[PDB]
Ligand SMILES: [Ca+2]
Ligand SMILES: [Ca+2]
Ligand SMILES: [Cl-]
Ligand SMILES: [Cl-]
Ligand SMILES: [Cl-]
Ligand SMILES: [Cl-]
């Protein structure tokens with residue numbers, strides 16, 4: 470899948486699919 | 502990025518980049 | 534705080550504040 | 566529910582109900 | 598270290614040191 | 630079990646058994 474680690478909400482075509490980190494803080498894994 | 506939720510270790514060209522789930526069980530997020 | 538374990542995105546006045554579970558599956562913790 | 570991000574164990578009226586963060590470190594989410 | 602995935606609070610000589618799973622459900626990792 | 634918070638892959642003797650933290654970053658919990 471195509472995934473991004475997001476500070477904001479996932480894109481419309483993406484789904485919250487797990488957890489990643491941004492500077493040691495839990496972030497959204499958004500995949501499609 | 503291109504990522505996969507994995508039952509085994511990440512491929513040689515992938516890196517463990519977060520946490521996902523397979524059937525409600527914690528799994529490796531592997532991204533190339 | 535007042536928080537909920539959500540299947541969908543956090544409400545307008547809520548913020549994604551952590552990780553909880555619904556039936557053993559990762560879910561958004563949303564707090565107002 | 567009523568939840569707090571705790572450094573110590575949950576109160577007797579509270580139950581550990583998820584994971585939150587305190588300065589990028591994992592902490593107990595205690596809810597009642 | 599010597600650690601256990603626990604359904605209850607960590608023992609008095611143990612410390613909550615991470616997150617594990619019991620039957621796909623989040624649980625305290627308690628380490629001596 | 631015998632567990633360690635790992636930056637690299639788990640030893641072949643060990644199994645990835647959950648999540649811990651190394652300086653506020655998610656690390657492999659490797660147990661045996
Ligand atoms: Ca789970
Ligand atoms: Ca962290
Ligand atoms: Cl983003
Ligand atoms: Cl979603
Ligand atoms: Cl998150
Ligand atoms: Cl796999």
Ligand SMILES: [Cl-]
Pocket residue numbers: 488520552584616648
């Ligand atoms: Cl998690």
Ligand SMILES: [Cl-]
Pocket residue numbers: 538539540541
């Ligand atoms: Cl909801």
Ligand SMILES: [Cl-]
Pocket residue numbers: 570571572573
């Ligand atoms: Cl506290």
Ligand SMILES: [Cl-]
Pocket residue numbers: 584591592593613615616
């Ligand atoms: Cl925790």
Ligand SMILES: [Cl-]
Pocket residue numbers: 602603604605
């Ligand atoms: Cl226990």
Ligand SMILES: [Cl-]
Pocket residue numbers: 581583584593615616623624625626
């Ligand atoms: Cl926990």
Ligand SMILES: [Cl-]
Pocket residue numbers: 630631661
């Ligand atoms: Cl054992």
Ligand SMILES: [Cl-]
Pocket residue numbers: 634635636637
């Ligand atoms: Cl290591």
